A and B are shown apart, each in its own frame.
Chain A
């Protein structure tokens, strides 16, 4: 798309979000509370916004999406099928921080509500191949300490953790599916 969907939907102005941050680092206040909010109209857009690369949209979309996932409740299950394309394309954007953020978002999605792993099981073909290529790549600094784990950009460790948490909830067929998609995966 020529212009980002979150861009043309934020200058749209119908977002209930406003940064207005007076806190430790940053925060966002909302003129609409989630129980009034309809997730069908908004969650695809928020997951779409993760692809955006220039400020303040990245922070806005990240915070909104994570808090929606946290306090959505059972409503996430219904909007699951629509979310597959944005999370696939954001992962395909091949940018390192974008993969890190969307990786964390997938983790919080899977752990957010129950009875969603089985529903996502048919959908590995969309989302795993991007992680397949970079599972191999990793840093080998040697003896020395790594001081950088304060923030999480180690793509290999993060994807391995996501595979672990994903399989812990997927079920019986999840293991064979993920092994089929990525060969080097190891049983847990």
Chain B
């Protein structure tokens, strides 16, 4: 609101999904001259679909170009690692066309 140049900011962060136990990790890389305490955003833990629920995420619930609800926040997944592409084509799960970040 008070920033003269900007009215809406964009935070970029990377997502890891461990295949050993289905746990999820989120962290945002540091950017110079940002003035934001940037580091780990979500600990290594399972994340339920909704708050106060026991229904967790699985690997088939993740895709590119989609919105994901993490603790009432809505992330937009825009791009995926190359290794994930081979993993998903091996498992038989299709992907959509990845775009670039606004």
Q: Do chains A and B touch in the complex (CB under 8 A)?
A: no
